[PDB]
């Protein structure tokens, strides 16, 4: 009878948390933002079209210099692009062609990729001979790697399909910290502007905030109805946005422990694959299964702008550090830069 | 400056070299055919692997055409996320134990989920019904009853178009074609020519599996080309 009473205990704790959140919320952000002037209609035009991928582009990551970007495709290639001149800096063949994530180190000296092999591979771009090779290979996950982000050259954090996020030390190649608590597998993770804590979205329709140093889930966010595919941290670092398979975008607040806004429309019924913010955080950029990328101002629920031009679904989306442009990868093997 | 022009010329040369390598890689890539091998651990998938850690890659060349078959080993039972990767695949080889009947209901539900997935709507499925000898001996013994598991099997009659194996009795053939017709009902309930199912009866000792896969791959690509030209 211990299990039943402890489940009842958990139910009471969840009710207490819900009541505390309820008492915390008295005015929604829509009411506060009603008085503010709406942003005008925003039109983005394709500036560059990057060609050279033979299969679907599963992911892409910008560099901190805001000029280079790395893209991963199912053909087995990891290509580093020069966005200004549309030139390929590197083309890295991969041991396993099924890769679903790629990360560009903020220093720019390394580039990581991972996928159905359950391995996160680190590639050194600054080899003495000048040819990119595998520096270290991180093999500790029992599920497919779905996202990886560099904290710095020394350590990387990877989410996986085994419902686990791990903190790795590149030099020794072992995971120092293991993050657990997700019932479903983790699809995406977003690092905060400070490398102190990060958020992750899983298939249990819950987003969890983890502190990197002490390695436990600080809080859990549950507003979505289906698997969360894309989670993005607000520029300030006090909030984050999540994209789900229920065809809606939810803006969650770290300090208020609630969901402030829901970005949805009746016309759109497809899932959100990737989500990203602008430099000011005013605009929310979201990829979709309907082959288009909607633009939503983060303060009001109204849609202002649309990014069309992809034949297949938009798998990945990225905004540069300076906020100059937006890169969208899709399953049609093309990356488009929008300014 | 002249240094900027030098930098630009060097990166243009690097881009040209990368593009030549990419052309070679494109030629290599479009020649080979990728296959997804999906099945249970007790369905007899390893037997199919025999004749030819997150994912396993087996390379077999039939008639001088390269075929890359990938079998997922370390993935969890939840497969709604990583099954989307195999939507540009040539064909999905679905291995099912025709003897175990409730494993067949789970296999039918999995086949229905694969068939009706929007990303997998253009992907053809090659259906292998393994352990034919085990099903035959189980039906001949009559210990377990298929009718108990499926009500429709009782009134089911072996199709006249179906070609029976001379050795087997009519009841084993009837059970085999009942399972095949359940899978074919799922396959033909939806799909307006985008994809097709290619059922096959196979055994552990059968060495024809590779030739069968070759033939259904030929059929799939030929059908797609004919549809492209509006000849089918």
């Amino acid at each position, epitope marked *: 009878s211990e299990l039943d009473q402890l489940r009842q205990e958990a139910e009471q704790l*969840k009710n207490q948390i819900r009541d505390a959140r309820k008492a915390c919320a008295d005015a929604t952000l829509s009411q506060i933002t009603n008085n503010i002037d709406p942003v005008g209609r925003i039109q983005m035009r394709t500036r560059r079209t990057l060609r050279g991928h033979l299969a679907k582009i599963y992911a892409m990551h910008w560099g901190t210099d805001s000029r280079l970007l790395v893209s991963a495709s199912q053909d087995g290639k990891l290509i580093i692009w020069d966005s200004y001149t549309t030139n390929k800096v590197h083309a890295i063949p991969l041991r396993s062609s099924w890769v679903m994530t790629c990360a560009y180190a903020p220093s720019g000296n390394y580039v990581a990729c991972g996928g159905l092999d359950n391995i996160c591979s680190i590639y050194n771009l600054k080899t003495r001979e000048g040819n990119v090779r595998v520096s270290r290979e991180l093999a500790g996950h029992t599920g497919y790697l779905s996202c990886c982000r560099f904290l710095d050259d020394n350590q990387i954090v990877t989410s996986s399909g085994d*419902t686990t996020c791990a903190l790795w030390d590149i030099e020794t190649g072992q995971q120092t910290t293991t993050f657990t608590g997700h*019932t*479903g597998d983790v699809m995406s993770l977003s690092l905060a502007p400070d490398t102190r804590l990060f958020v992750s979205g899983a*298939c*249990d*329709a819950s987003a969890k905030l983890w502190d990197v140093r002490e390695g436990m889930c600080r809080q859990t966010f*549950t507003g979505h*109805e*289906s*698997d969360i595919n894309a989670i993005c941290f607000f520029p300030n670092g006090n909030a984050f946005a999540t994209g789900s*398979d*229920d*065809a809606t975008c939810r803006l969650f607040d770290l300090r208020a422990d609630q969901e402030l806004m829901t970005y949805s429309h009746d016309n759109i*019924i497809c*899932g959100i694959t990737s989500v990203s913010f602008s430099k000011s955080g005013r605009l929310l950029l979201a990829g979709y299964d309907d082959f288009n990328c909607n633009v939503w101002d983060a303060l009001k629920a109204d849609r202002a702008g649309v990014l069309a031009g992809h034949d297949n679904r938009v798998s990945c989306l990225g905004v540069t550090d300076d906020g100059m442009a937006v890169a969208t990868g899709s399953w049609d093997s093309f990356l488009k830069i929008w300014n | 400056t002249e240094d900027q022009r030098n930098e630009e010329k060097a990166q243009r040369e690097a881009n040209k070299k990368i593009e030549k390598q990419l052309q070679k890689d494109k030629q290599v890539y479009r020649a080979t055919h990728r296959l997804l091998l999906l099945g249970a651990g007790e369905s007899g998938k390893n037997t199919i692997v025999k004749q030819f850690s997150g994912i396993f890659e087996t390379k077999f060349q039939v008639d001088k055409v390269n075929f890359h078959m990938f079998d997922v080993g370390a993935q*969890r*039972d*939840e*497969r*709604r996320k990583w*099954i989307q990767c195999f939507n540009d695949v040539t064909a999905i080889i679905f291995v099912v134990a025709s003897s175990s009947y*409730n494993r067949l*209901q*789970a296999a039918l*539900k999995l086949f*229905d*989920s*694969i*068939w*009706n*997935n*929007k990303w997998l709507r253009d992907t053809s499925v090659i259906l292998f019904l393994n352990k034919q000898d085990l099903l035959a001996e189980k039906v001949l013994a009559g210990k377990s009853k298929i009718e*108990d*598991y*499926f*009500p*429709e099997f009782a009134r089911y009659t072996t199709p006249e178009d179906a070609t029976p194996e001379p050795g087997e009795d009519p009841r084993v053939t009837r059970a085999k074609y009942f399972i095949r017709d359940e899978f074919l009902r799922i396959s033909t309930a*939806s799909g307006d020519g985008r994809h097709y199912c290619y059922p096959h009866f196979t055994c552990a000792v059968d060495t024809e599996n590779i030739r069968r896969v070759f033939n259904d791959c030929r059929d799939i690509i030929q059908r797609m080309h004919l549809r492209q030209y509006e000849l089918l």
Partner: nanobody
Amino acid sequence: QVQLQESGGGLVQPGGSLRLSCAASGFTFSNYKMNWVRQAPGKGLEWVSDISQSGASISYTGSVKGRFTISRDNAKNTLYLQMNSLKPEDTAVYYCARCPAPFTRDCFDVTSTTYAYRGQGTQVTVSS
């Protein structure tokens, strides 16, 4: 928060009528296809029945075909399973499992060991 609560499970005599009610909240009930799954003692989860979003398309497993009926009330956000008669074979816990995505024909991983959108379940026992 996606939660699914099952009710109406209990010990019954063989051949007796039993009705299972699943109360679902936290999502738009009309947008999703609902399922019923069961786990016999010492056995894995197996699929029993499902009903489409509108309720027009209904399917059952072969063991309970013509014996169990499944209905949903979109206004009341509840899923019903009526068991008119039952052999002592189906003495297992019955869960109401929602399909992972809305407006989708397929229902993936509904019988997985660690499916998130499955309910807690109710134990149904058949004994003489």
